[PDB]
Each structure stands twice: as structure tokens, then as C-alpha cells.
Design a protein around this ligand. Sequence first.
Ligand SMILES: Oc1cc2cc[nH]c2cc1O
Ligand SMILES: Oc1cc2cc[nH]c2cc1O
Ligand SMILES: [Fe+3]
Ligand SMILES: [Fe+3]
Length: 689
Amino acid sequence: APRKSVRWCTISPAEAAKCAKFQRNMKKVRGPSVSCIRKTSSFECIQAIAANKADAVTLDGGLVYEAGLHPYKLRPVAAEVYQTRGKPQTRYYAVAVVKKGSGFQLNQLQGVKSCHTGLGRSAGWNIPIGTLRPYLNWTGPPEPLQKAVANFFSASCVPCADGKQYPNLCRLCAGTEADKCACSSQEPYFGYSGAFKCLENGAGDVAFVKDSTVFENLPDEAERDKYELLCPDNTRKPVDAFKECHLARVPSHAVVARSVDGREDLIWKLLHRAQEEFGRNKSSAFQLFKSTPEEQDLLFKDSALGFVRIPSQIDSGLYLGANYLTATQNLRETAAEVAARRERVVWCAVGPEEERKCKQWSDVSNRKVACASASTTEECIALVLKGEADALNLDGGFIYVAGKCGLVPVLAENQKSQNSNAPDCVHRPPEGYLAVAVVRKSDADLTWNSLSGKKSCHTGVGRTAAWNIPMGLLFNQTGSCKFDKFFSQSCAPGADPQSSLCALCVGNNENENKCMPNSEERYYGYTGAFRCLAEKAGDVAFVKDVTVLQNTDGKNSEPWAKDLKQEDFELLCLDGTRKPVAEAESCHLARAPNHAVVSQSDRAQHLKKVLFLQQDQFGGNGPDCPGKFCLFKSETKNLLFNDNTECLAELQGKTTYEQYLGSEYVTSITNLRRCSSSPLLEACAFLRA
Ligand SMILES: Oc1cc2cc[nH]c2cc1O
Ligand SMILES: Oc1cc2cc[nH]c2cc1O
Ligand SMILES: [Fe+3]
Ligand SMILES: [Fe+3]
């Protein structure tokens, strides 16, 4: 029945004492118990935590990063919330603070004395350094980064630095004998405030700190006017201009925990009670976000408003974002490794069969294109958000998820439409495809209004033609979220493997990976969902009109297809009727947006460039198409892009998922969400909040 205490790791005596005050006040309020373990630096608590010696520790974005690394695999449980000078936020601006009348600019630090929060921290190291990489005249990784800084700065206090090999990096540190350059509050120059005192006490000329630091230490506006900030556009602006004069915007510190059996609910229950009982002016007996004047930021970040629970999918990589990761990862990569990655385009292939095609597209492009892969479409968007992939072609349904995660549509799939197939394609207003309900002519008893308890074949959950358009329509007539109960049994890859929704699925050839939302499931996609119907595993397949058309009348020679005839098939019209597959225009459930390519708004223009080339070489009219590679072809398996794709067209203005998908469909997708929501969609609500 009972549940124990959260073991909090501490890094310095002053920190232990505060913890003790926290353990004392937790039990006196009869709330969750804590315990205090004692290590000497945050990296050690990372170690101490992964080794099940400790359970929690607040880390700076930069250490979150290090802690998420392999051997440790820790994850951010809760994010501290801060000032903002406005609305509270879980982010903050890194600044470089200097005294007025020092004359230099951001591009002149060569030979200046500098004070840092600590080795490896967002604002005190990772961020300033990566900004000065160009002036470091640094070989790259083989040569220790600390050697570059130790030569560039005349003497600095970067705590945690190897002051025995790099004395110049610890020289300015004020500390007793072995306390000097200590990686805890032992060295007075440690942390936001220590780096500030190192400046104001005249040991250093530039302070790499947080936006609040100057305000936390100089409460009187007159004091602050003796100070300024160096802006990356090589000018100086008042300390109050951080929104304008900053090196970068990092994510807030956060409490980390183990990935497996980390006791997340325990920690969270602790901190929640702690904000409620000792948060901002809740108490006087003990204040969570307050410290002793000697050493600041003990345990948490002083004067933080509280914490926010970090959703479960989120790992450090997703926590930090593309931007922060690229830069940290960029201080561990070669100048040539960096510029290579910025020029190529990493595509996220969903599953085995797409990764191979991608591999062919990689080779044939002479590596202007490279690949990354995942088992599901959500995992790929995660890759795109982490910054490990640049794009992927998505269905109207997942444009929504991507779009909710801050991703933008670059170019849209334009099927071999009908007007005048000349250079119209890339400028042809995309026109969409009609999703339909398809059943065999035979079962003539079947009508739209008799689908209840019948078997169903679905392209997949989350997707338009299938899931969203029919489930959205039925949910309007039945008023229920029990989606797995309308159809007796179904195959809809991506569902719960144990539900009726996954019953008719089939998996790959040796029957493995049943219901997996990818090509490994033979019944996955428009192709598979139609097959599901042909091979008589289901009674109604929700697909677009064209799907029946491209797999009947010997067009597809894959065994199950071969003998199929478009006459054997009919569509289920919303008004009870049934028309031949040729009547979709007057008998469809809806008109959906074409799939479209998506990327960060960052790479969309580069992404667009490489794509026009790639598609002119291997597109619908690519010289080397039949020849060596056909981007828009895959033997009916619709890999990477649909097989009837003529080219990738312009968005005609529709630059946001909202404009592209259109109002209705977006509202239709939100209505369905009242029932089910998705882990990515949630994680993205936190991340983009
Ligand atoms: O979460 C905390 C953990 C440790 C690590 C030691 N001091 C700490 C700071 C914290 O607030
Ligand atoms: O129907 C499609 C076909 C393939 C196969 C796995 N990748 C794809 C996803 C879809 O959008
Ligand atoms: Fe920080
Ligand atoms: Fe579709």
C-alpha cells in the first residue's frame, strides 16, 4: 500500500542544509517525505541518480542534455517556471553582461577576462561559446574545446573546468585552496550570481548569465545603469533590453529522473505539495524558492514561480528542441560536419520499405538527401522536432499533428490531375481527393446506414480518407466515443493491438507486426485497406476513389489484385444509395487535402530548393525516371509519396496547417479529439505553450 521518500541529491554543504530545512518542513506539514543524499556536483547526481543512489535533481537545460545521454538516460519530469518581466514562462534568455565604458563588443572578446556560470551550462557556457566558435580558431572535436577557450580568454572562472590542465579557465575563481573552481556553491563564482559578482567585483569584464541576474542583484535602477548587455549585432543596449539583446533563448531548468522506474508520481507529488505549501509567499516557516545570501540558487532557481509537469513522451531531446540541440551537439562536431548537415536534407522514412527507397534516393542524389527512420509517423515528427530529420510527406490528418507541433507545410502532392499536364503541376492549384466508402457490389444488402456491427478496413488511425472522415461522420450519428464498438471487428493499423480495431489486421508475411501503422502490415494504407476488402477480411473499406481504380482491371498484378475488376466494386453514398466506383463525384463522404511535405519553417525554403531539383531529375517527367530512380513510383505500395503524384506543387498561399487543411476539417478533427487525443499532440501542447 505505502510509497517511500524521494531521495534528493545535493551538491554542496549549503545545499544540504537547505534540503534539511525542506525535509524538516515537509514532515512538519505532514506532506510527502524527502531524503538528502550528498554528492559534489550536478554531474555526480546525474551519476548518483542513474545508479539508483538518488532519485531527483534540477538541472540546467545544458545538463538535461548531458543527462539524457546514453549511459544515464535520465528524463525531465518537471520544468521550473520563471519571471519573464511579463507572462510566466518555462524558457529564458541568455545574456552577456558588462560594465559601461568597457568599450568592446561581442566581436571583440579576444583577450578579455570572463566569468561563467559553470562548465556546460546553457547561458554560462554552451550558449556563449557556440556564439564565439568563429573567433576561437579551433580545429574541432579532436582538440578539447576547453583549450580553445583557455587561449581566447585571458583568464576566466568557468567552474567545473580542469584548472590543472587549463589553469587559465579557473584563475579568476575566488575559492579557498581546493575550493577554487569547485563545481558547487563552494566556489563563490559559481552560478548566475557568482558569475555576476565576478563581474561587479572587477575580476572579470564580461558575465555570461541569465536575463534576471542583474535585476536579482541590483534592485535599484541606478545600480543597473552602470551596466549593459552585448548584442550579437555588435552593439550595446540597457540591461532591461534582453528581449532585444540576447545571445539565445534556452529552455528552463528542470527536475530530472530515471527513464525506467524513476518514480515520477512520487517526485511530482512532492514538488506539487512543495509549491502549494512553500512556494511564493505561501509560507514564512520555509520558502522553497529562497536561499541564503552567501550562496544563491540552492536546490531550485530562486524566485521561480513553481513547476509544471512535463508530459510523459518528452525526453531531453524533445525537451530542448531542434535549436538548443543543434548548438550543443555543434560544440562536439567538426566545422565540416556542421556545414554538411545544413546542406543536405534528412528525410524521415516510416518503416523498412520506405527506408530502402530512401536509401536509393540518397545514393542517386549523391547525398544531397540522406535518411532517418522510425516505425510510425509520430516517431518521425518527433525526429523532425528533435532536429534529427528535415521532413516527411504527411497525410491531411498528420499535417494536423505536425501543425500543432509547430511544423509548416512546404510543398503539396499534386496527383496526375486533369486539365493540361504541362508545367501546370507545380503551380496548379492543388485540388484534393475524395475519400469514399467502398463495398463489393455483391453484398448489396449493405448501405451506409447498415454499417453498424459490420467489419471494417481502415487506412490507419489519425489519417483522413480512413479514420477522420468516416469516424467523424459516424460520431455525429451515434454520439459515442466507443469507436471500437461501432464496427464488429476491424483492421486499422496503429490502434491498440489488443482491441477489435486490430482484429482483421494481418501483419507482414510470416504474420509478425500485426496492426503496426506502416508497410510491414500488408493491410496498411489505401492499398492495404482496399486489399483488406478484396481478400474478404472486411466488408467496408474507407479509401479514396482512385485507390479502387489503381488496383483493379489488371493494373496491379500482385496476386490478390490481378483478377480484380472495377465492376465488382461499388461505393456507399451518404444518402443511403450505391453507385459504381466511377460515380465518386456524386457519392463520396468528403473532399480532403492532399498530403503535403512538412518541415520547420526554418528549413522550408532550403527544403523547397532541393525538392524542386530532386523532382525534376526523378519526378513525373524526370529524365532519369524510368532510367535510374522514380521518386513518385513504388510498385503500388505508395512509399514516401503516392504513386500517382505528378510533382510537388506550391501551396497557393496556404502556408499554415490551418489555411491548408481548411477550417471545417480542422474543426472536424478537434471534435473527434473530445474522444481520443494522442501523446504527441499533448507533448506538443506543453512544448508550444
Ligand atoms: O532539484 C534539485 C536537485 C539538486 C542537485 C543538488 N542540488 C539540487 C538542486 C535542486 O533543486
Ligand atoms: O499509404 C502510405 C504508404 C506508405 C507505406 C509506409 N509508408 C507509407 C505511409 C502512407 O502514407
Ligand atoms: Fe540556466
Ligand atoms: Fe490520404
